[PDB]
């Protein structure tokens, strides 16, 4: 039926937990999840807006990995 | 270990965000991957910084103000 | 206060969910496409435009 | 003209530092000025972030650890 | 170092919105300033050596500053 | 504990000292200076050399 695959929205709470665990965090406030989602969105928006723009100047509708690499290099941090 | 963000939800998120910029966009698999690697690195580093803030405040539990302080100092907004 | 990240039941966060664990084909540009990257002048032009929009904001 | 570091002591600091790298040096005063503008801007910003840290720890008094944190998060730490 | 005076450091801290300081702040600040200046100047001097003059200029400094980041 | 930056007496820090408030002349551009900026060749040479300098350190 794939009700799951169809209804998934944004990144999951256990992903956030895995991320915080990787960054060495021990306990999190409940408000962290929402905050993190917000932070991610802004990040992606900033990279993709650039990537997309690069793509426009390449005269294509397909975004390559090099477009993303250049986009990230614009925001710095890192490759 | 070794999983962080799940592939499909992330893909969906990227496509949904990219809509508002340009309609009928297409991504190479390598490009979605690149964004996922970058995003994971970003968030993990940010949690390291967030944690430094919480420790500075004598807390084990990180909080939104920890993230906010970290991003403030890094100059993000 | 908060949630302990390390303790009983943390393994729950580490399982496989097959349906979510792979990219789908929708949106994907594949495969045989000959698509080529930015030249240095295309790149420079794009970055110029992005400096511009950054100035205007 | 807002007083931060006095001109003369600064000029002498720059010359003293430089005398290691290269012997017998001259400076356009505009060069010294640019260094001073940049140094004071840097320190003021650093102090703003340091302050943020102190406040985060509920202190009004800033400490070396506040500077060290701010610098860490800016990624200067070398 | 040591021409960076305590009053200078207080002036700076005040300008950065700081209301009060530990005693060890002075030394820290000097340390920090030193490193910053050592970096920039080094770069600047190099720009001057390549220019083939004994005189450092505002542009050399601007480039050296640009180079940090 | 700490030291207050704001309070009775802080005027001390704000005094004008003409001897110290200007760059002395030793030593600086003669201002009779005929000086040349950086040709991009020398700029690029410089930044290449400095890049290498950095690499061999960290």
mmCIF file of N, CA, C and O in Angstrom, chain D residues 2-6 9-10 13-18 20-22 24-28 30-32 34-35 38-48 50-51 60-64 67-68 71 76 78, chain E residues 1-5 7-9 11-13 15-25 28-29 32-42 44-45 48-49 53-59 61-62 65:
data_model
loop_
_atom_site.group_PDB
_atom_site.id
_atom_site.type_symbol
_atom_site.label_atom_id
_atom_site.label_comp_id
_atom_site.label_asym_id
_atom_site.label_seq_id
_atom_site.Cartn_x
_atom_site.Cartn_y
_atom_site.Cartn_z
ATOM 1 N N UNK D 2 37.008 58.393 17.391
ATOM 2 C CA UNK D 2 36.767 57.520 18.551
ATOM 3 C C UNK D 2 38.026 56.825 19.054
ATOM 4 O O UNK D 2 38.683 56.134 18.296
ATOM 5 N N UNK D 3 38.330 56.980 20.344
ATOM 6 C CA UNK D 3 39.555 56.432 20.944
ATOM 7 C C UNK D 3 39.436 54.957 21.242
ATOM 8 O O UNK D 3 38.617 54.560 22.068
ATOM 9 N N UNK D 4 40.275 54.133 20.622
ATOM 10 C CA UNK D 4 40.356 52.760 21.097
ATOM 11 C C UNK D 4 41.778 52.406 21.546
ATOM 12 O O UNK D 4 42.098 52.486 22.743
ATOM 13 N N UNK D 5 42.643 52.097 20.585
ATOM 14 C CA UNK D 5 44.072 51.943 20.829
ATOM 15 C C UNK D 5 44.707 53.239 20.337
ATOM 16 O O UNK D 5 44.299 53.768 19.297
ATOM 17 N N UNK D 6 45.692 53.771 21.055
ATOM 18 C CA UNK D 6 46.322 55.001 20.563
ATOM 19 C C UNK D 6 47.214 54.721 19.370
ATOM 20 O O UNK D 6 47.813 53.654 19.267
ATOM 21 N N UNK D 9 51.397 53.905 20.031
ATOM 22 C CA UNK D 9 51.685 52.549 20.520
ATOM 23 C C UNK D 9 51.375 51.488 19.473
ATOM 24 O O UNK D 9 52.106 50.498 19.362
ATOM 25 N N UNK D 10 50.303 51.695 18.712
ATOM 26 C CA UNK D 10 49.931 50.750 17.667
ATOM 27 C C UNK D 10 50.984 50.679 16.554
ATOM 28 O O UNK D 10 51.487 49.604 16.233
ATOM 29 N N UNK D 13 53.872 48.824 17.659
ATOM 30 C CA UNK D 13 53.592 47.386 17.704
ATOM 31 C C UNK D 13 53.734 46.729 16.327
ATOM 32 O O UNK D 13 54.319 45.644 16.174
ATOM 33 N N UNK D 14 53.186 47.400 15.326
ATOM 34 C CA UNK D 14 53.211 46.887 13.978
ATOM 35 C C UNK D 14 54.655 46.806 13.520
ATOM 36 O O UNK D 14 55.104 45.764 13.032
ATOM 37 N N UNK D 15 55.390 47.897 13.703
ATOM 38 C CA UNK D 15 56.784 47.903 13.291
ATOM 39 C C UNK D 15 57.576 46.828 14.022
ATOM 40 O O UNK D 15 58.393 46.138 13.409
ATOM 41 N N UNK D 16 57.317 46.667 15.319
ATOM 42 C CA UNK D 16 58.082 45.699 16.107
ATOM 43 C C UNK D 16 57.842 44.275 15.615
ATOM 44 O O UNK D 16 58.783 43.500 15.437
ATOM 45 N N UNK D 17 56.571 43.944 15.400
ATOM 46 C CA UNK D 17 56.195 42.651 14.835
ATOM 47 C C UNK D 17 56.841 42.413 13.470
ATOM 48 O O UNK D 17 57.426 41.356 13.226
ATOM 49 N N UNK D 18 56.741 43.406 12.593
ATOM 50 C CA UNK D 18 57.268 43.288 11.242
ATOM 51 C C UNK D 18 58.793 43.136 11.193
ATOM 52 O O UNK D 18 59.320 42.471 10.298
ATOM 53 N N UNK D 20 60.724 41.354 12.586
ATOM 54 C CA UNK D 20 61.137 39.959 12.575
ATOM 55 C C UNK D 20 61.149 39.440 11.149
ATOM 56 O O UNK D 20 62.186 38.996 10.650
ATOM 57 N N UNK D 21 59.983 39.479 10.513
ATOM 58 C CA UNK D 21 59.814 39.006 9.139
ATOM 59 C C UNK D 21 60.781 39.619 8.116
ATOM 60 O O UNK D 21 61.398 38.896 7.331
ATOM 61 N N UNK D 22 60.901 40.946 8.123
ATOM 62 C CA UNK D 22 61.809 41.647 7.221
ATOM 63 C C UNK D 22 62.484 42.814 7.936
ATOM 64 O O UNK D 22 61.819 43.614 8.589
ATOM 65 N N UNK D 24 64.566 46.435 8.153
ATOM 66 C CA UNK D 24 64.518 47.713 7.435
ATOM 67 C C UNK D 24 63.242 47.915 6.612
ATOM 68 O O UNK D 24 63.268 47.878 5.382
ATOM 69 N N UNK D 25 62.128 48.144 7.300
ATOM 70 C CA UNK D 25 60.834 48.292 6.639
ATOM 71 C C UNK D 25 60.272 49.705 6.733
ATOM 72 O O UNK D 25 60.612 50.472 7.634
ATOM 73 N N UNK D 26 59.425 50.044 5.769
ATOM 74 C CA UNK D 26 58.704 51.305 5.775
ATOM 75 C C UNK D 26 57.228 51.004 5.626
ATOM 76 O O UNK D 26 56.853 49.991 5.032
ATOM 77 N N UNK D 27 56.386 51.886 6.151
ATOM 78 C CA UNK D 27 54.948 51.715 6.022
ATOM 79 C C UNK D 27 54.277 52.975 5.510
ATOM 80 O O UNK D 27 54.561 54.062 5.989
ATOM 81 N N UNK D 28 53.379 52.834 4.542
ATOM 82 C CA UNK D 28 52.468 53.924 4.255
ATOM 83 C C UNK D 28 51.622 54.065 5.509
ATOM 84 O O UNK D 28 51.211 53.060 6.082
ATOM 85 N N UNK D 30 48.734 54.923 5.668
ATOM 86 C CA UNK D 30 47.434 54.373 5.318
ATOM 87 C C UNK D 30 47.424 52.881 5.582
ATOM 88 O O UNK D 30 46.382 52.310 5.918
ATOM 89 N N UNK D 31 48.591 52.255 5.437
ATOM 90 C CA UNK D 31 48.732 50.836 5.749
ATOM 91 C C UNK D 31 48.538 50.585 7.251
ATOM 92 O O UNK D 31 47.759 49.696 7.655
ATOM 93 N N UNK D 32 49.243 51.369 8.071
ATOM 94 C CA UNK D 32 49.063 51.285 9.513
ATOM 95 C C UNK D 32 47.589 51.499 9.859
ATOM 96 O O UNK D 32 47.020 50.742 10.631
ATOM 97 N N UNK D 34 44.984 50.952 8.078
ATOM 98 C CA UNK D 34 44.174 49.819 7.662
ATOM 99 C C UNK D 34 44.312 48.686 8.670
ATOM 100 O O UNK D 34 43.322 48.024 9.034
ATOM 101 N N UNK D 35 45.544 48.469 9.127
ATOM 102 C CA UNK D 35 45.786 47.468 10.164
ATOM 103 C C UNK D 35 45.039 47.823 11.443
ATOM 104 O O UNK D 35 44.453 46.960 12.079
ATOM 105 N N UNK D 38 41.279 47.345 11.097
ATOM 106 C CA UNK D 38 40.979 45.912 11.088
ATOM 107 C C UNK D 38 41.137 45.244 12.460
ATOM 108 O O UNK D 38 40.328 44.390 12.843
ATOM 109 N N UNK D 39 42.175 45.638 13.195
ATOM 110 C CA UNK D 39 42.474 45.055 14.499
ATOM 111 C C UNK D 39 41.407 45.419 15.505
ATOM 112 O O UNK D 39 40.886 44.563 16.222
ATOM 113 N N UNK D 40 41.066 46.697 15.540
ATOM 114 C CA UNK D 40 40.029 47.155 16.445
ATOM 115 C C UNK D 40 38.666 46.553 16.090
ATOM 116 O O UNK D 40 37.894 46.175 16.981
ATOM 117 N N UNK D 41 38.369 46.444 14.794
ATOM 118 C CA UNK D 41 37.111 45.808 14.394
ATOM 119 C C UNK D 41 37.057 44.361 14.875
ATOM 120 O O UNK D 41 36.056 43.906 15.465
ATOM 121 N N UNK D 42 38.159 43.653 14.648
ATOM 122 C CA UNK D 42 38.282 42.274 15.086
ATOM 123 C C UNK D 42 38.046 42.135 16.591
ATOM 124 O O UNK D 42 37.198 41.354 17.020
ATOM 125 N N UNK D 43 38.783 42.903 17.387
ATOM 126 C CA UNK D 43 38.652 42.817 18.835
ATOM 127 C C UNK D 43 37.270 43.202 19.333
ATOM 128 O O UNK D 43 36.736 42.579 20.245
ATOM 129 N N UNK D 44 36.676 44.223 18.739
ATOM 130 C CA UNK D 44 35.341 44.590 19.159
ATOM 131 C C UNK D 44 34.349 43.464 18.888
ATOM 132 O O UNK D 44 33.579 43.091 19.774
ATOM 133 N N UNK D 45 34.389 42.897 17.680
ATOM 134 C CA UNK D 45 33.518 41.778 17.362
ATOM 135 C C UNK D 45 33.739 40.592 18.285
ATOM 136 O O UNK D 45 32.780 39.933 18.756
ATOM 137 N N UNK D 46 35.015 40.326 18.559
ATOM 138 C CA UNK D 46 35.372 39.227 19.433
ATOM 139 C C UNK D 46 34.739 39.447 20.793
ATOM 140 O O UNK D 46 34.190 38.519 21.388
ATOM 141 N N UNK D 47 34.794 40.688 21.268
ATOM 142 C CA UNK D 47 34.249 41.015 22.580
ATOM 143 C C UNK D 47 32.732 40.920 22.602
ATOM 144 O O UNK D 47 32.146 40.557 23.624
ATOM 145 N N UNK D 48 32.087 41.256 21.489
ATOM 146 C CA UNK D 48 30.639 41.078 21.408
ATOM 147 C C UNK D 48 30.266 39.597 21.567
ATOM 148 O O UNK D 48 29.385 39.249 22.382
ATOM 149 N N UNK D 50 32.116 37.154 22.846
ATOM 150 C CA UNK D 50 32.521 36.772 24.185
ATOM 151 C C UNK D 50 31.425 37.120 25.180
ATOM 152 O O UNK D 50 31.047 36.320 26.043
ATOM 153 N N UNK D 51 30.891 38.321 25.026
ATOM 154 C CA UNK D 51 29.838 38.772 25.897
ATOM 155 C C UNK D 51 28.640 37.848 25.819
ATOM 156 O O UNK D 51 28.087 37.443 26.846
ATOM 157 N N UNK D 60 27.764 38.389 34.191
ATOM 158 C CA UNK D 60 28.055 39.680 33.599
ATOM 159 C C UNK D 60 29.557 39.854 33.372
ATOM 160 O O UNK D 60 29.994 40.664 32.540
ATOM 161 N N UNK D 61 30.349 39.055 34.076
ATOM 162 C CA UNK D 61 31.792 39.168 33.959
ATOM 163 C C UNK D 61 32.298 38.230 32.889
ATOM 164 O O UNK D 61 32.021 37.038 32.919
ATOM 165 N N UNK D 62 33.029 38.767 31.926
ATOM 166 C CA UNK D 62 33.623 37.915 30.913
ATOM 167 C C UNK D 62 34.947 37.359 31.381
ATOM 168 O O UNK D 62 35.670 37.989 32.158
ATOM 169 N N UNK D 63 35.246 36.160 30.903
ATOM 170 C CA UNK D 63 36.417 35.430 31.345
ATOM 171 C C UNK D 63 37.132 34.885 30.140
ATOM 172 O O UNK D 63 36.562 34.816 29.067
ATOM 173 N N UNK D 64 38.400 34.517 30.309
ATOM 174 C CA UNK D 64 39.142 33.866 29.222
ATOM 175 C C UNK D 64 38.385 32.704 28.564
ATOM 176 O O UNK D 64 38.445 32.586 27.339
ATOM 177 N N UNK D 67 36.092 33.982 25.822
ATOM 178 C CA UNK D 67 36.852 34.253 24.608
ATOM 179 C C UNK D 67 37.196 32.958 23.884
ATOM 180 O O UNK D 67 37.057 32.846 22.666
ATOM 181 N N UNK D 68 37.616 31.961 24.642
ATOM 182 C CA UNK D 68 38.038 30.711 24.048
ATOM 183 C C UNK D 68 36.885 29.994 23.369
ATOM 184 O O UNK D 68 37.062 29.354 22.322
ATOM 185 N N UNK D 71 35.922 32.101 20.138
ATOM 186 C CA UNK D 71 36.923 31.830 19.113
ATOM 187 C C UNK D 71 36.780 30.420 18.581
ATOM 188 O O UNK D 71 36.971 30.195 17.401
ATOM 189 N N UNK D 76 38.432 29.780 14.894
ATOM 190 C CA UNK D 76 39.754 30.380 14.791
ATOM 191 C C UNK D 76 40.841 29.529 15.477
ATOM 192 O O UNK D 76 42.032 29.816 15.346
ATOM 193 N N UNK D 78 43.249 27.834 16.195
ATOM 194 C CA UNK D 78 44.704 27.702 16.044
ATOM 195 C C UNK D 78 45.516 28.719 16.863
ATOM 196 O O UNK D 78 44.970 29.659 17.450
ATOM 197 N N UNK E 1 51.138 44.525 23.683
ATOM 198 C CA UNK E 1 52.362 43.757 23.896
ATOM 199 C C UNK E 1 53.622 44.612 23.726
ATOM 200 O O UNK E 1 54.231 44.662 22.648
ATOM 201 N N UNK E 2 53.986 45.314 24.796
ATOM 202 C CA UNK E 2 53.089 45.522 25.936
ATOM 203 C C UNK E 2 52.415 46.879 25.761
ATOM 204 O O UNK E 2 51.765 47.398 26.674
ATOM 205 N N UNK E 3 52.632 47.463 24.582
ATOM 206 C CA UNK E 3 52.084 48.757 24.222
ATOM 207 C C UNK E 3 50.573 48.769 24.148
ATOM 208 O O UNK E 3 49.967 49.833 24.007
ATOM 209 N N UNK E 4 49.959 47.592 24.275
ATOM 210 C CA UNK E 4 48.511 47.520 24.335
ATOM 211 C C UNK E 4 48.194 47.658 25.802
ATOM 212 O O UNK E 4 48.471 46.768 26.597
ATOM 213 N N UNK E 5 47.643 48.817 26.146
ATOM 214 C CA UNK E 5 47.442 49.235 27.529
ATOM 215 C C UNK E 5 46.180 48.656 28.116
ATOM 216 O O UNK E 5 45.260 48.302 27.381
ATOM 217 N N UNK E 7 43.923 50.437 29.716
ATOM 218 C CA UNK E 7 42.828 51.305 29.266
ATOM 219 C C UNK E 7 42.397 51.047 27.832
ATOM 220 O O UNK E 7 41.207 51.129 27.549
ATOM 221 N N UNK E 8 43.328 50.747 26.937
ATOM 222 C CA UNK E 8 42.938 50.398 25.566
ATOM 223 C C UNK E 8 41.989 49.184 25.537
ATOM 224 O O UNK E 8 40.982 49.167 24.818
ATOM 225 N N UNK E 9 42.330 48.168 26.318
ATOM 226 C CA UNK E 9 41.547 46.949 26.342
ATOM 227 C C UNK E 9 40.165 47.192 26.946
ATOM 228 O O UNK E 9 39.169 46.645 26.482
ATOM 229 N N UNK E 11 38.649 50.105 26.815
ATOM 230 C CA UNK E 11 37.922 50.881 25.813
ATOM 231 C C UNK E 11 37.296 49.956 24.795
ATOM 232 O O UNK E 11 36.126 50.119 24.440
ATOM 233 N N UNK E 12 38.068 48.963 24.362
ATOM 234 C CA UNK E 12 37.599 48.023 23.346
ATOM 235 C C UNK E 12 36.436 47.206 23.878
ATOM 236 O O UNK E 12 35.369 47.187 23.277
ATOM 237 N N UNK E 13 36.647 46.552 25.019
ATOM 238 C CA UNK E 13 35.601 45.789 25.680
ATOM 239 C C UNK E 13 34.315 46.605 25.855
ATOM 240 O O UNK E 13 33.210 46.106 25.627
ATOM 241 N N UNK E 15 33.389 49.044 24.063
ATOM 242 C CA UNK E 15 32.832 49.303 22.749
ATOM 243 C C UNK E 15 32.099 48.067 22.230
ATOM 244 O O UNK E 15 31.223 48.150 21.367
ATOM 245 N N UNK E 16 32.469 46.919 22.781
ATOM 246 C CA UNK E 16 31.867 45.663 22.418
ATOM 247 C C UNK E 16 30.736 45.308 23.355
ATOM 248 O O UNK E 16 30.240 44.186 23.311
ATOM 249 N N UNK E 17 30.341 46.249 24.215
ATOM 250 C CA UNK E 17 29.160 46.072 25.049
ATOM 251 C C UNK E 17 29.381 45.332 26.358
ATOM 252 O O UNK E 17 28.437 45.055 27.088
ATOM 253 N N UNK E 18 30.637 45.018 26.647
ATOM 254 C CA UNK E 18 31.038 44.358 27.883
ATOM 255 C C UNK E 18 30.943 45.292 29.104
ATOM 256 O O UNK E 18 31.416 46.427 29.060
ATOM 257 N N UNK E 19 30.300 44.820 30.176
ATOM 258 C CA UNK E 19 30.134 45.611 31.405
ATOM 259 C C UNK E 19 31.112 45.305 32.556
ATOM 260 O O UNK E 19 31.202 46.087 33.509
ATOM 261 N N UNK E 20 31.920 44.254 32.437
ATOM 262 C CA UNK E 20 32.774 43.843 33.553
ATOM 263 C C UNK E 20 33.696 42.729 33.108
ATOM 264 O O UNK E 20 33.273 41.854 32.345
ATOM 265 N N UNK E 21 34.911 42.675 33.666
ATOM 266 C CA UNK E 21 35.927 41.714 33.169
ATOM 267 C C UNK E 21 36.713 41.003 34.258
ATOM 268 O O UNK E 21 36.939 41.552 35.320
ATOM 269 N N UNK E 22 37.143 39.776 33.981
ATOM 270 C CA UNK E 22 38.000 39.080 34.920
ATOM 271 C C UNK E 22 39.377 39.719 34.780
ATOM 272 O O UNK E 22 39.634 40.437 33.809
ATOM 273 N N UNK E 23 40.294 39.391 35.681
ATOM 274 C CA UNK E 23 41.596 40.027 35.678
ATOM 275 C C UNK E 23 42.456 39.448 34.583
ATOM 276 O O UNK E 23 43.365 40.104 34.074
ATOM 277 N N UNK E 24 42.154 38.211 34.204
ATOM 278 C CA UNK E 24 42.962 37.511 33.218
ATOM 279 C C UNK E 24 42.607 37.891 31.784
ATOM 280 O O UNK E 24 43.276 37.454 30.847
ATOM 281 N N UNK E 25 41.565 38.704 31.624
ATOM 282 C CA UNK E 25 41.123 39.140 30.304
ATOM 283 C C UNK E 25 42.240 39.892 29.558
ATOM 284 O O UNK E 25 42.500 39.628 28.373
ATOM 285 N N UNK E 28 44.745 37.655 27.921
ATOM 286 C CA UNK E 28 44.113 36.917 26.836
ATOM 287 C C UNK E 28 44.032 37.783 25.603
ATOM 288 O O UNK E 28 44.465 37.378 24.513
ATOM 289 N N UNK E 29 43.542 39.000 25.804
ATOM 290 C CA UNK E 29 43.278 39.881 24.692
ATOM 291 C C UNK E 29 44.574 40.184 23.947
ATOM 292 O O UNK E 29 44.625 40.112 22.708
ATOM 293 N N UNK E 32 45.551 37.338 21.816
ATOM 294 C CA UNK E 32 44.721 37.256 20.642
ATOM 295 C C UNK E 32 45.167 38.288 19.616
ATOM 296 O O UNK E 32 45.390 37.959 18.437
ATOM 297 N N UNK E 33 45.378 39.512 20.078
ATOM 298 C CA UNK E 33 45.673 40.572 19.134
ATOM 299 C C UNK E 33 46.964 40.211 18.459
ATOM 300 O O UNK E 33 47.082 40.321 17.226
ATOM 301 N N UNK E 34 47.901 39.706 19.263
ATOM 302 C CA UNK E 34 49.219 39.409 18.744
ATOM 303 C C UNK E 34 49.065 38.471 17.552
ATOM 304 O O UNK E 34 49.526 38.787 16.440
ATOM 305 N N UNK E 35 48.323 37.379 17.757
ATOM 306 C CA UNK E 35 48.258 36.344 16.737
ATOM 307 C C UNK E 35 47.699 36.939 15.460
ATOM 308 O O UNK E 35 48.254 36.750 14.365
ATOM 309 N N UNK E 36 46.651 37.733 15.632
ATOM 310 C CA UNK E 36 45.958 38.310 14.509
ATOM 311 C C UNK E 36 46.977 39.113 13.725
ATOM 312 O O UNK E 36 47.225 38.834 12.543
ATOM 313 N N UNK E 37 47.647 40.032 14.419
ATOM 314 C CA UNK E 37 48.590 40.920 13.754
ATOM 315 C C UNK E 37 49.741 40.154 13.127
ATOM 316 O O UNK E 37 50.241 40.534 12.062
ATOM 317 N N UNK E 38 50.148 39.059 13.762
ATOM 318 C CA UNK E 38 51.301 38.351 13.238
ATOM 319 C C UNK E 38 50.907 37.777 11.907
ATOM 320 O O UNK E 38 51.688 37.810 10.960
ATOM 321 N N UNK E 39 49.685 37.261 11.841
ATOM 322 C CA UNK E 39 49.201 36.649 10.615
ATOM 323 C C UNK E 39 49.173 37.650 9.481
ATOM 324 O O UNK E 39 49.944 37.536 8.517
ATOM 325 N N UNK E 40 48.309 38.649 9.637
ATOM 326 C CA UNK E 40 48.071 39.639 8.605
ATOM 327 C C UNK E 40 49.379 40.218 8.107
ATOM 328 O O UNK E 40 49.685 40.132 6.906
ATOM 329 N N UNK E 41 50.168 40.756 9.037
ATOM 330 C CA UNK E 41 51.426 41.400 8.680
ATOM 331 C C UNK E 41 52.320 40.459 7.866
ATOM 332 O O UNK E 41 52.856 40.862 6.819
ATOM 333 N N UNK E 42 52.427 39.201 8.302
ATOM 334 C CA UNK E 42 53.248 38.242 7.576
ATOM 335 C C UNK E 42 52.835 38.256 6.114
ATOM 336 O O UNK E 42 53.662 38.539 5.230
ATOM 337 N N UNK E 44 51.074 40.469 4.493
ATOM 338 C CA UNK E 44 51.327 41.786 3.925
ATOM 339 C C UNK E 44 52.778 41.915 3.492
ATOM 340 O O UNK E 44 53.066 42.369 2.377
ATOM 341 N N UNK E 45 53.689 41.466 4.355
ATOM 342 C CA UNK E 45 55.110 41.637 4.073
ATOM 343 C C UNK E 45 55.495 40.821 2.845
ATOM 344 O O UNK E 45 56.299 41.252 2.011
ATOM 345 N N UNK E 48 54.710 42.490 -0.153
ATOM 346 C CA UNK E 48 55.666 43.563 -0.370
ATOM 347 C C UNK E 48 56.966 43.039 -0.971
ATOM 348 O O UNK E 48 57.602 43.720 -1.780
ATOM 349 N N UNK E 49 57.342 41.818 -0.601
ATOM 350 C CA UNK E 49 58.609 41.258 -1.062
ATOM 351 C C UNK E 49 58.503 40.958 -2.538
ATOM 352 O O UNK E 49 59.451 41.161 -3.295
ATOM 353 N N UNK E 53 59.717 46.010 -3.214
ATOM 354 C CA UNK E 53 59.998 47.271 -2.539
ATOM 355 C C UNK E 53 60.186 46.998 -1.055
ATOM 356 O O UNK E 53 59.860 45.915 -0.572
ATOM 357 N N UNK E 54 60.744 47.969 -0.345
ATOM 358 C CA UNK E 54 60.923 47.855 1.095
ATOM 359 C C UNK E 54 59.767 48.541 1.826
ATOM 360 O O UNK E 54 59.743 48.597 3.060
ATOM 361 N N UNK E 55 58.806 49.051 1.056
ATOM 362 C CA UNK E 55 57.687 49.807 1.620
ATOM 363 C C UNK E 55 56.335 49.094 1.535
ATOM 364 O O UNK E 55 55.843 48.794 0.447
ATOM 365 N N UNK E 56 55.738 48.846 2.697
ATOM 366 C CA UNK E 56 54.421 48.228 2.790
ATOM 367 C C UNK E 56 53.348 49.264 2.490
ATOM 368 O O UNK E 56 53.405 50.375 3.007
ATOM 369 N N UNK E 57 52.347 48.892 1.698
ATOM 370 C CA UNK E 57 51.303 49.838 1.300
ATOM 371 C C UNK E 57 49.923 49.402 1.771
ATOM 372 O O UNK E 57 49.723 48.250 2.164
ATOM 373 N N UNK E 58 48.978 50.339 1.741
ATOM 374 C CA UNK E 58 47.599 50.051 2.123
ATOM 375 C C UNK E 58 47.008 48.903 1.309
ATOM 376 O O UNK E 58 46.269 48.084 1.848
ATOM 377 N N UNK E 59 47.337 48.840 0.020
ATOM 378 C CA UNK E 59 46.845 47.753 -0.819
ATOM 379 C C UNK E 59 47.381 46.388 -0.395
ATOM 380 O O UNK E 59 46.628 45.409 -0.355
ATOM 381 N N UNK E 61 48.171 45.544 2.516
ATOM 382 C CA UNK E 61 47.413 45.236 3.714
ATOM 383 C C UNK E 61 46.008 44.749 3.388
ATOM 384 O O UNK E 61 45.522 43.801 3.999
ATOM 385 N N UNK E 62 45.362 45.404 2.427
ATOM 386 C CA UNK E 62 44.008 45.029 2.035
ATOM 387 C C UNK E 62 43.979 43.603 1.516
ATOM 388 O O UNK E 62 43.100 42.829 1.882
ATOM 389 N N UNK E 65 44.459 41.155 4.265
ATOM 390 C CA UNK E 65 43.244 41.044 5.050
ATOM 391 C C UNK E 65 42.249 40.178 4.316
ATOM 392 O O UNK E 65 41.580 39.333 4.911
#
